[PDB]
Amino acid sequence: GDGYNGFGNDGSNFGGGGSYNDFGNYNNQSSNFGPMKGGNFGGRSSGPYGGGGQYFA
Amino acid sequence: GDGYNGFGNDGSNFGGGGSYNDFGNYNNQSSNFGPMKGGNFGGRSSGPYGGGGQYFA
Amino acid sequence: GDGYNGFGNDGSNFGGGGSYNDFGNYNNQSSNFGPMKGGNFGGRSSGPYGGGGQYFA
Amino acid sequence: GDGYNGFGNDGSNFGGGGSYNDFGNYNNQSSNFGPMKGGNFGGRSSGPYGGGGQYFA
Amino acid sequence: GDGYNGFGNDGSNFGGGGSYNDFGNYNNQSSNFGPMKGGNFGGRSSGPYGGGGQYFA
Amino acid sequence: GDGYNGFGNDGSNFGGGGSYNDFGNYNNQSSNFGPMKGGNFGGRSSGPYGGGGQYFA
Amino acid sequence: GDGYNGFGNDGSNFGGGGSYNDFGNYNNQSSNFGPMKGGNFGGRSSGPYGGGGQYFA
Amino acid sequence: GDGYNGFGNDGSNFGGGGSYNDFGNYNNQSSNFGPMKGGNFGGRSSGPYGGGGQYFA
Amino acid sequence: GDGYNGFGNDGSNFGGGGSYNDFGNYNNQSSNFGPMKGGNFGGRSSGPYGGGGQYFA
Amino acid sequence: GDGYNGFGNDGSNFGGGGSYNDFGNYNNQSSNFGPMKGGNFGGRSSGPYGGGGQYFA
Amino acid sequence: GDGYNGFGNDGSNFGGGGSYNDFGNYNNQSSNFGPMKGGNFGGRSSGPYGGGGQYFA
Amino acid sequence: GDGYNGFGNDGSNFGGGGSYNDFGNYNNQSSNFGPMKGGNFGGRSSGPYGGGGQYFA
Amino acid sequence: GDGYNGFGNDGSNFGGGGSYNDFGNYNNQSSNFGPMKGGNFGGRSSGPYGGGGQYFA
Amino acid sequence: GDGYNGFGNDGSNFGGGGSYNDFGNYNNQSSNFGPMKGGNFGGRSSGPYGGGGQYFA
Amino acid sequence: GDGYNGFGNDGSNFGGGGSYNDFGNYNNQSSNFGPMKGGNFGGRSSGPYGGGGQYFA
Amino acid sequence: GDGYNGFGNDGSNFGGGGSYNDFGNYNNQSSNFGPMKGGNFGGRSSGPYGGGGQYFA
Amino acid sequence: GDGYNGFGNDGSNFGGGGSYNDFGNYNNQSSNFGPMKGGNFGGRSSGPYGGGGQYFA
Amino acid sequence: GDGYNGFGNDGSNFGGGGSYNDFGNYNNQSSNFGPMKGGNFGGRSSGPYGGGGQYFA
Amino acid sequence: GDGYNGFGNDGSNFGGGGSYNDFGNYNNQSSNFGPMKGGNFGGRSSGPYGGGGQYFA
Amino acid sequence: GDGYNGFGNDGSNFGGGGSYNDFGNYNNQSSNFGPMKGGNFGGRSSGPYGGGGQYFA
C-alpha cells in the first residue's frame, strides 16, 4: 500500500506562543500521526431551526 | 496495508507557551498517534430550536 | 493491516507552560496512542430548545 | 489487525508546568494508550430547555 | 486483532508541576493503559430545565 | 483478541508536585491498567431543574 | 479475549508530593488494575431542584 | 475471558508524601486490584431540594 | 472467566507519609484485592432538603 | 468464575507513617482481600432536613 | 464461582506507625479476609433534623 | 461457591506501634476472617433533632 | 502504492506567534502526517431552516 | 506509483505572525503531509432554506 | 509513476504577517505535501432555497 | 511518467504582508506540492433556487 | 515523459503587499508545484434557477 | 517528452502591491509549476434558468 | 520533444501595482510554467436559458 | 523537435500600472511559459437560448 518515511514530524506547540490569543469554537485543531482513513474535517453546523438566524460579527 | 515510519513525531505542548490564552469550546485539540479509522472531526452543532438564534461576536 | 513504527511520540505538556491560561469547555484535549477505531471528534452541542439563543462573546 | 511499535510514548505532565492555570469544564483531557474502539470525543451538551439561553464570555 | 508494543508509556504527573493551578469541573483527566472498548469521552451536560440559563465567564 | 505489551506504564503522581493546587469537582482522575470495556467518561451533570441557572466564574 | 502484559504499572503517589494541595469533591481518583467491565466514570450531579441555582467561583 | 499479567502494580501511598494536604469530600480514592465488574465511579450528588442552592467557592 | 496474575500489588501506606494531613469526609479510601462485582463508587450525598443550601468554602 | 493469583498483596500501614494526621469522618478506609460482591462505596449522606444547611470550610 | 490464591495478604498495622494521629469518627477502618457478600461501605449519616445545620470546620 | 486459599493473612498490630495516637467514636476497626455476608460498614449516625447542629472541628 | 520521503516536516506553531489573535469557528486547523484516505475538508454548514437568514458582518 | 522526495517541507506557523488577526469560519487551514486520496476541499454551504437570505458584508 | 524531487518546499506563514487581516468564510487555505488524488477545490455553495437571495456587499 | 526537480519552491506567506486585508469567501488559496491528479478548481456555486437572485456589489 | 528542472520557483506572497485589499469569491488562487493531471480551472457557477437574475454591480 | 529548463520562475506577489484592489469572482488566479495535462481554463458559467437575465455593470 | 531554456521567467505582480483596480469575473489570470498539454482558455459562458438576456452595460 | 532559448521572458505587471482599471469578464489574461499544445484561446460563448438577446454597450 502507501507508505511514509517522514523524519522530524514536529507539528508541535499549536498556539504559536502569542499571549492573549483567543481560540474559537467547534474547530478541529488536532495533530494526527500515522495512517488515517475516513478523512479530516472541520466543524459541522445544522443551522438554527424554526426561523432563528445565524449571525457572525 | 499502509505503513508509517516516522521519527520524532513530537506534537507536544499544544498551547504554544503564551500566557493569558483562552482555549475555546467544543474544539478537537487532541494529539493522536497510530492507525486511525473513522476520520478526524472538529466540533458539531445542532443549532438552537424553536426560533432561537446563534450569535458570534 | 496498518502499522506504526514511530520513535519518540511526544504529545506531552499540553498547556504549553504559560501561566494564567484558561482552558475552555467541552474540548477534546486528549492524547491518544495506539490503533484507534471510530474516529476522533470535537465537542458536540444540541443547541438550546424552545427559543433559547446560543451566544458567544 | 493493526499494529503499533511506538518507542517512548510521553503524553505526560498535561498542564504544561505553568502556574495559575485554570482548567476547563467537561473537557476530555485523558491520556490513552493501547487499542481503542468506539472513538475519542470531547464534551457533550444538550442546551437548556424551556427558553433558557446558553452564554459564553 | 490489534496489538500494542509500547516501550515507556509515561502519561504521568498530570498537573504539570505548576503551583496554584485550579483543575476544573466534570473533566475527564484519566490515564488509561490497555485495550479499551466503548470510546473515551469528555463530560456531559443536560442543560438547565424550566428556563434556567447556562452561563460561562 | 487485542493485546498489550507495554513496558513502564508509569501514570503516577497525578498532582504534578506543585503546591497550593486545587483539584476541582466531579472530575475523573483515575489511572486504569488492564483491558477495559464500557468506555471512559468525564463527569456528568443533569443541570438544575425548575428554572435554576448554572453558573461558572 | 483481550490481554495485558504490562511491566511496571506504578500509578502511585497520586497527590504528586506537593504540600497544601486541596483535593476537591466527588472526584474519581481511584487506581484500578485488572480486567474492567462497565467503564470508568467521573462524578455525577443531579442539579438542585425547585429553582435553586448551581454556582462555581 | 480477559487476562492480566501485571508485574509490579504499586498503586501505593496515595497522598503523595506532601504535608498539610487536605483530602476532599465524597471522592473515590480507592486502589483496586483484580477483575472488576460494574464499573468505577466518582462521587454522586442529588442537589439540594426546595430551592436550596449548590455553591463551590 | 477473567484472570489476574499480578506480582507485587502493594497498594499500601495510603496517607503518603506526610504529616499534618487532614483526610476528608465520606471518601472511599479502601484497598481492594480480588474479584470484584458491583462496581467501585465514591461517596454519595442526597443534598439538603427544605431550602437548605450546600456550601463548599 | 474469575480468579486472582496475586503474590504480595500488602495493602498495609494505611496512615503512611506521618504524624499529627487527622483521619476525617465517615470515610471508607478498609483493606479487603478475597472475592467481593455488592461493590465498594464511600460515605453516604442524607442532607439535613427542615432547612438546615451543609457547610464545608 | 470465584477463587483467590493470594500469598502474603498483610493488610496490617493500619495506623502507619506515626504518632499523635487522630483516627477520627465513623470511619470504616477494618481489614477483611475471605469471600465477602453485601459490599463494603463507609460511614452513613442522616443529617440533623428540624433545621439543625451540618458543619465541617 | 467462592474460595479463599490465602497464606500469611497478618492483619495484626492495628496501630503500627505509634505513640499518643487516639481513636474517634463509632469507627469499625475490626479484623475479619473467613466467609462473610451482609457486608462491612462504617459508623452510622442519625443527626441531632429539634434544630441541634452537628459540628466538627 | 505511493511513497513519501519527506525530511523535516515542521508544520508547527500554527497560530504564528502573534498576540490577540482570534481563531474562528468550525475551521479545520489540524496538522496531519501519514497516508490519508477520504480527503481533507473545511467546515460544513446546513444553513438555517424556516426562513432564518445567515449573516456575515 | 507516485513518489515524493521533498527535503524541508516547512508548512509552519499558518497565522503569519501578525497580531489582532481574525481567522475565518468553516475554512480548511490544515497542513497535510503524506499521500492523500479523496482530494482537498474548502468549506461547504447548503444555503438557508425556506426563503432565508445569505448575506456577506 | 510520477515523481517529485523538490528541495526546500515552503508554504509557511500563510497570513503574510500583516495585522488586522480578516480571513474569509469557507475558503480552502491548506498546505498539502505529497501525492494527491482527487483534486483540489475551493468552497462549495448550494444557494438559498425557496426564493432566498444570495448577496455579496 | 513525469518528473519535477524544482529547487526552492516557495509559495509562502500568501496574504502578502499587507494589513486590513479580507481573504474573501469560498476561495481556493491552498499551496500544493507533489504529484497531483484530479485537477485544481476554484469555488463552485449552484445558484439560488426558486427565483432568488445572486447579487454582487 | 515530460520533465521540469526549474530553479527558484517563487510563486509566493500572493496578495502583493497592498493593504485594504479585498480578495474575491470562488476564485482559484492556489500555488501548485509538481506534475498536475486533470487541468487547472477557475470558479464555476450554475446560475440561479426559477428566473432568479445574476447581477454584477 | 517535452522539457523545461527555466532558471528563475517568479509568478509571485500577484496583486501587484496596490491598495484597495478588488479581486473579482470565479477567476483562475493560480500559479502553476511543473508538467500540466488537461489545460488551463478561466471560470465557467451556466446562465440563469427560467428566464432570469445575466447582467454586468 | 520540445525544449525550453528560458532564463528569467517573470510573470509576477499581475495587478500591475495600481490601486482601486477591479479584477473582473470568470477570467483566466494564472501564471503557468512548464510543459502544458490541453491548451489555455479564457472563461466560458453557456448563456441564459428560457428567454433571459445577457447584458454588458 | 522545436526549441526556445529566450533570455528575459518577462510577461509581468499585466495590469499596466494604471489605477481604477476594470478588467473584463471571461477574458484569457494568463502568462504561460514552456512548450504548449492545444493552442491558446480567448473566451467562449454560447448565446442565450429561447429567444434571449445578447447586448453590449
mmCIF file with all atom_site columns, N, CA and C in Angstrom, chain P residues 4-34:
data_model
loop_
_atom_site.group_PDB
_atom_site.id
_atom_site.type_symbol
_atom_site.label_atom_id
_atom_site.label_alt_id
_atom_site.label_comp_id
_atom_site.label_asym_id
_atom_site.label_entity_id
_atom_site.label_seq_id
_atom_site.pdbx_PDB_ins_code
_atom_site.Cartn_x
_atom_site.Cartn_y
_atom_site.Cartn_z
_atom_site.occupancy
_atom_site.B_iso_or_equiv
_atom_site.pdbx_formal_charge
_atom_site.auth_seq_id
_atom_site.auth_comp_id
_atom_site.auth_asym_id
_atom_site.auth_atom_id
_atom_site.pdbx_PDB_model_num
ATOM 1  N N  . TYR P 1 4  ? 9.787   16.131 -11.659 1.00 0.00 ? 4  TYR P N  1
ATOM 2  C CA . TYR P 1 4  ? 9.878   17.514 -11.199 1.00 0.00 ? 4  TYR P CA 1
ATOM 3  C C  . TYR P 1 4  ? 11.092  17.634 -10.295 1.00 0.00 ? 4  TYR P C  1
ATOM 4  N N  . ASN P 1 5  ? 12.032  18.495 -10.670 1.00 0.00 ? 5  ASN P N  1
ATOM 5  C CA . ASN P 1 5  ? 13.310  18.644 -9.987  1.00 0.00 ? 5  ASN P CA 1
ATOM 6  C C  . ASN P 1 5  ? 13.493  20.069 -9.479  1.00 0.00 ? 5  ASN P C  1
ATOM 7  N N  . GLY P 1 6  ? 12.405  20.690 -9.034  1.00 0.00 ? 6  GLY P N  1
ATOM 8  C CA . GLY P 1 6  ? 12.443  22.109 -8.718  1.00 0.00 ? 6  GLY P CA 1
ATOM 9  C C  . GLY P 1 6  ? 13.165  22.390 -7.412  1.00 0.00 ? 6  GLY P C  1
ATOM 10 N N  . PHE P 1 7  ? 14.074  23.362 -7.444  1.00 0.00 ? 7  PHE P N  1
ATOM 11 C CA . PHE P 1 7  ? 14.805  23.815 -6.269  1.00 0.00 ? 7  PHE P CA 1
ATOM 12 C C  . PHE P 1 7  ? 14.228  25.140 -5.790  1.00 0.00 ? 7  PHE P C  1
ATOM 13 N N  . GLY P 1 8  ? 13.874  25.207 -4.509  1.00 0.00 ? 8  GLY P N  1
ATOM 14 C CA . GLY P 1 8  ? 13.325  26.427 -3.947  1.00 0.00 ? 8  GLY P CA 1
ATOM 15 C C  . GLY P 1 8  ? 11.888  26.726 -4.325  1.00 0.00 ? 8  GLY P C  1
ATOM 16 N N  . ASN P 1 9  ? 10.958  25.924 -3.812  1.00 0.00 ? 9  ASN P N  1
ATOM 17 C CA . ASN P 1 9  ? 9.539   26.006 -4.159  1.00 0.00 ? 9  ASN P CA 1
ATOM 18 C C  . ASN P 1 9  ? 8.834   26.788 -3.054  1.00 0.00 ? 9  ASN P C  1
ATOM 19 N N  . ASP P 1 10 ? 8.744   28.108 -3.226  1.00 0.00 ? 10 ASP P N  1
ATOM 20 C CA . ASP P 1 10 ? 8.383   28.986 -2.118  1.00 0.00 ? 10 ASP P CA 1
ATOM 21 C C  . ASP P 1 10 ? 6.886   28.913 -1.821  1.00 0.00 ? 10 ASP P C  1
ATOM 22 N N  . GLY P 1 11 ? 6.062   29.673 -2.541  1.00 0.00 ? 11 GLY P N  1
ATOM 23 C CA . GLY P 1 11 ? 4.629   29.623 -2.288  1.00 0.00 ? 11 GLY P CA 1
ATOM 24 C C  . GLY P 1 11 ? 4.179   30.017 -0.895  1.00 0.00 ? 11 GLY P C  1
ATOM 25 N N  . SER P 1 12 ? 5.023   30.694 -0.124  1.00 0.00 ? 12 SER P N  1
ATOM 26 C CA . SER P 1 12 ? 4.736   31.036 1.262   1.00 0.00 ? 12 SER P CA 1
ATOM 27 C C  . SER P 1 12 ? 4.026   32.383 1.415   1.00 0.00 ? 12 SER P C  1
ATOM 28 N N  . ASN P 1 13 ? 3.611   32.644 2.657   1.00 0.00 ? 13 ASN P N  1
ATOM 29 C CA . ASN P 1 13 ? 3.132   33.945 3.142   1.00 0.00 ? 13 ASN P CA 1
ATOM 30 C C  . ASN P 1 13 ? 2.066   34.554 2.225   1.00 0.00 ? 13 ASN P C  1
ATOM 31 N N  . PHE P 1 14 ? 1.115   33.696 1.846   1.00 0.00 ? 14 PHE P N  1
ATOM 32 C CA . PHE P 1 14 ? 0.027   34.020 0.926   1.00 0.00 ? 14 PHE P CA 1
ATOM 33 C C  . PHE P 1 14 ? -0.528  35.437 1.035   1.00 0.00 ? 14 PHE P C  1
ATOM 34 N N  . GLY P 1 15 ? -0.879  35.870 2.247   1.00 0.00 ? 15 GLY P N  1
ATOM 35 C CA . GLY P 1 15 ? -1.560  37.147 2.398   1.00 0.00 ? 15 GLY P CA 1
ATOM 36 C C  . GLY P 1 15 ? -0.785  38.359 1.923   1.00 0.00 ? 15 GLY P C  1
ATOM 37 N N  . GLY P 1 16 ? 0.522   38.229 1.716   1.00 0.00 ? 16 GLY P N  1
ATOM 38 C CA . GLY P 1 16 ? 1.308   39.294 1.135   1.00 0.00 ? 16 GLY P CA 1
ATOM 39 C C  . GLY P 1 16 ? 1.950   40.238 2.128   1.00 0.00 ? 16 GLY P C  1
ATOM 40 N N  . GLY P 1 17 ? 1.519   40.224 3.386   1.00 0.00 ? 17 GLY P N  1
ATOM 41 C CA . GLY P 1 17 ? 2.069   41.095 4.402   1.00 0.00 ? 17 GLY P CA 1
ATOM 42 C C  . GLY P 1 17 ? 1.392   42.442 4.533   1.00 0.00 ? 17 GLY P C  1
ATOM 43 N N  . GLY P 1 18 ? 0.399   42.737 3.699   1.00 0.00 ? 18 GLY P N  1
ATOM 44 C CA . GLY P 1 18 ? -0.466  43.869 3.951   1.00 0.00 ? 18 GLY P CA 1
ATOM 45 C C  . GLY P 1 18 ? -1.400  43.640 5.123   1.00 0.00 ? 18 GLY P C  1
ATOM 46 N N  . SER P 1 19 ? -1.857  44.746 5.698   1.00 0.00 ? 19 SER P N  1
ATOM 47 C CA . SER P 1 19 ? -2.794  44.732 6.810   1.00 0.00 ? 19 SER P CA 1
ATOM 48 C C  . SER P 1 19 ? -4.202  45.076 6.336   1.00 0.00 ? 19 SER P C  1
ATOM 49 N N  . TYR P 1 20 ? -5.180  44.780 7.192   1.00 0.00 ? 20 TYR P N  1
ATOM 50 C CA . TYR P 1 20 ? -6.595  45.064 6.948   1.00 0.00 ? 20 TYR P CA 1
ATOM 51 C C  . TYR P 1 20 ? -7.144  44.387 5.695   1.00 0.00 ? 20 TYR P C  1
ATOM 52 N N  . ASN P 1 21 ? -6.473  43.364 5.176   1.00 0.00 ? 21 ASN P N  1
ATOM 53 C CA . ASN P 1 21 ? -6.997  42.647 4.023   1.00 0.00 ? 21 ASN P CA 1
ATOM 54 C C  . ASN P 1 21 ? -8.143  41.726 4.426   1.00 0.00 ? 21 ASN P C  1
ATOM 55 N N  . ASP P 1 22 ? -9.025  41.449 3.467   1.00 0.00 ? 22 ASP P N  1
ATOM 56 C CA . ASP P 1 22 ? -10.071 40.443 3.613   1.00 0.00 ? 22 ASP P CA 1
ATOM 57 C C  . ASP P 1 22 ? -9.803  39.318 2.619   1.00 0.00 ? 22 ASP P C  1
ATOM 58 N N  . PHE P 1 23 ? -9.473  38.135 3.135   1.00 0.00 ? 23 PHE P N  1
ATOM 59 C CA . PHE P 1 23 ? -9.226  36.953 2.306   1.00 0.00 ? 23 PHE P CA 1
ATOM 60 C C  . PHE P 1 23 ? -10.563 36.277 1.999   1.00 0.00 ? 23 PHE P C  1
ATOM 61 N N  . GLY P 1 24 ? -11.346 36.937 1.148   1.00 0.00 ? 24 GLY P N  1
ATOM 62 C CA . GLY P 1 24 ? -12.764 36.661 0.984   1.00 0.00 ? 24 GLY P CA 1
ATOM 63 C C  . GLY P 1 24 ? -13.230 35.238 0.734   1.00 0.00 ? 24 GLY P C  1
ATOM 64 N N  . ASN P 1 25 ? -14.542 35.092 0.576   1.00 0.00 ? 25 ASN P N  1
ATOM 65 C CA . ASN P 1 25 ? -15.250 33.835 0.777   1.00 0.00 ? 25 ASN P CA 1
ATOM 66 C C  . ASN P 1 25 ? -15.024 32.834 -0.357  1.00 0.00 ? 25 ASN P C  1
ATOM 67 N N  . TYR P 1 26 ? -15.197 31.555 -0.018  1.00 0.00 ? 26 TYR P N  1
ATOM 68 C CA . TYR P 1 26 ? -15.200 30.414 -0.933  1.00 0.00 ? 26 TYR P CA 1
ATOM 69 C C  . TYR P 1 26 ? -13.953 30.273 -1.797  1.00 0.00 ? 26 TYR P C  1
ATOM 70 N N  . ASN P 1 27 ? -12.906 31.054 -1.566  1.00 0.00 ? 27 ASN P N  1
ATOM 71 C CA . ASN P 1 27 ? -11.753 30.956 -2.447  1.00 0.00 ? 27 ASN P CA 1
ATOM 72 C C  . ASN P 1 27 ? -11.009 29.644 -2.209  1.00 0.00 ? 27 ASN P C  1
ATOM 73 N N  . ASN P 1 28 ? -10.280 29.204 -3.231  1.00 0.00 ? 28 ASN P N  1
ATOM 74 C CA . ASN P 1 28 ? -9.219  28.219 -3.071  1.00 0.00 ? 28 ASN P CA 1
ATOM 75 C C  . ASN P 1 28 ? -7.886  28.946 -2.958  1.00 0.00 ? 28 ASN P C  1
ATOM 76 N N  . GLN P 1 29 ? -7.245  28.828 -1.795  1.00 0.00 ? 29 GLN P N  1
ATOM 77 C CA . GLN P 1 29 ? -5.997  29.522 -1.503  1.00 0.00 ? 29 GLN P CA 1
ATOM 78 C C  . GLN P 1 29 ? -4.900  28.559 -1.065  1.00 0.00 ? 29 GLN P C  1
ATOM 79 N N  . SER P 1 30 ? -5.050  27.274 -1.368  1.00 0.00 ? 30 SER P N  1
ATOM 80 C CA . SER P 1 30 ? -4.102  26.265 -0.924  1.00 0.00 ? 30 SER P CA 1
ATOM 81 C C  . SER P 1 30 ? -2.759  26.395 -1.638  1.00 0.00 ? 30 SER P C  1
ATOM 82 N N  . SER P 1 31 ? -1.725  25.861 -0.993  1.00 0.00 ? 31 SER P N  1
ATOM 83 C CA . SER P 1 31 ? -0.407  25.677 -1.589  1.00 0.00 ? 31 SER P CA 1
ATOM 84 C C  . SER P 1 31 ? -0.112  24.186 -1.657  1.00 0.00 ? 31 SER P C  1
ATOM 85 N N  . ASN P 1 32 ? 0.026   23.658 -2.869  1.00 0.00 ? 32 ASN P N  1
ATOM 86 C CA . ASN P 1 32 ? 0.067   22.222 -3.103  1.00 0.00 ? 32 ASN P CA 1
ATOM 87 C C  . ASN P 1 32 ? 1.411   21.825 -3.694  1.00 0.00 ? 32 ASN P C  1
ATOM 88 N N  . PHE P 1 33 ? 2.024   20.791 -3.122  1.00 0.00 ? 33 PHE P N  1
ATOM 89 C CA . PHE P 1 33 ? 3.336   20.313 -3.534  1.00 0.00 ? 33 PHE P CA 1
ATOM 90 C C  . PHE P 1 33 ? 3.275   18.812 -3.761  1.00 0.00 ? 33 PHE P C  1
ATOM 91 N N  . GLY P 1 34 ? 3.845   18.356 -4.872  1.00 0.00 ? 34 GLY P N  1
ATOM 92 C CA . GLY P 1 34 ? 3.883   16.947 -5.175  1.00 0.00 ? 34 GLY P CA 1
ATOM 93 C C  . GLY P 1 34 ? 2.945   16.575 -6.301  1.00 0.00 ? 34 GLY P C  1
#
